[PDB]
Write a protein that binds this ligand. Sequence first.
Ligand SMILES: [Cs+]
Ligand SMILES: [Cs+]
Ligand SMILES: [Cs+]
Length: 138
Amino acid sequence: NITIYHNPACGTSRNTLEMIRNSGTEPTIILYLENPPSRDELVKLIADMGISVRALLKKNVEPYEQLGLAEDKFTDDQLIDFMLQHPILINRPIVVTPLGTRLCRPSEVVLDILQDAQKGAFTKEDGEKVVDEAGKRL
Ligand SMILES: [Cs+]
Ligand SMILES: [Cs+]
Ligand SMILES: [Cs+]
């Protein structure tokens, strides 16, 4: 039972999705830019990922820039409500599996929460080797 909050235009998200598939399961794919999580769902995701609200904020996107979010003048709940109102602010990809939830940045973080081992070697789309055929992390 795996869910990925995916942005197909993001290489990290594409690599994470292919590693999930290479473990032998096809995840539910949520295109969060169009179908964001609810507030309670987002609050839960953040608690499970063990990171701060601000660590989830995507920088270098229009609402981050124009709402001045680089400045330390926002409570965690203000930041959560901006994420809900402007889903491009939610960094990506988030992956949920029975073992837990992670912000999979870099993408190989996903290996922590995949229950089954990669089924053969995995190389990222830019040629960076991740696991060899034997299954060792490079
Ligand atoms: Cs939702
Ligand atoms: Cs694991
Ligand atoms: Cs890259």
